[PDB]
Amino acid sequence: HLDDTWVTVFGFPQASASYILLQFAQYGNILKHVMSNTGNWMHIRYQSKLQARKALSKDGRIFGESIMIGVKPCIDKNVME
Amino acid sequence: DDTWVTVFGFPQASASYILLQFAQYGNILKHVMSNTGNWMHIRYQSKLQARKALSKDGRIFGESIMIGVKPCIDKNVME
């Protein structure tokens, strides 16, 4: 159940990627993160399942302005390696 | 009311493409597109249709735009 510390944040334009990443740094310790070249999403790996849930609780909220953000349990196995 | 749904996470340029995508899940009686941007509200005809859209939450659409779908909560929009 190690995969339970990974979330997938999405919905932001590429220019706001780092901003959103900072915002999610507030929910815990990001041990690792993988941005995406193509899509509007990133994968964040927290230190504890408790921090991932805090991140998840943010699904649907509006960030830094006019950016509704989606947060889902990560399911990309290749990325979680 | 359980017929309204909010779709989000797409850049303004893909807005009508996403609406086209969501049109195929039921009959859209009304749609409102945020100007501030990033989301839009859609009101299907039946609750079973909204729940159909609702289930696409987290799916990746076309040009690889992950989309979020949640029950609509902006009361003033729903009138």
Added chain:
Amino acid sequence: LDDTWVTVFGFPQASASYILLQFAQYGNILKHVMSNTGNWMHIRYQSKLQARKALSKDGRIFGESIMIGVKPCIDKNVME
């Protein structure tokens, strides 16, 4: 695939999204190109039969008193 393309015209920008949704019910819209300047959009359906259905809507009224025009698409750049 020219015969699956159609161009819809005669509506104000404000009603563009609403018109695309109206035509979305005649077939499967595989591609659409709207003009930022003109009062027309280009729509590509999956089959010629759908386009023919969109075509039968030439000169009819859509809700708010918006008489729409529909003609086979002749813009070769858009279709390519």
Added chain:
Amino acid sequence: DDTWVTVFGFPQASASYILLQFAQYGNILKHVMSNTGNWMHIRYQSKLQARKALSKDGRIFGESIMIGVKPCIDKNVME
């Protein structure tokens, strides 16, 4: 009546410019604008002129206005 045509597809603010434009196809004996719809009905002198109007269906007028032209079917207007 084969001399009546109804032109459509233009915003309220272009009504006069479009009428002016269709005045170059024949003598417009009578014209009726709609206070609600994006169309006007134009009665020409000859059917020969009216057919010339109809030949303009689908063409882009002036700026960015594609225009539709069809035979008038409004019986009330053709009073």
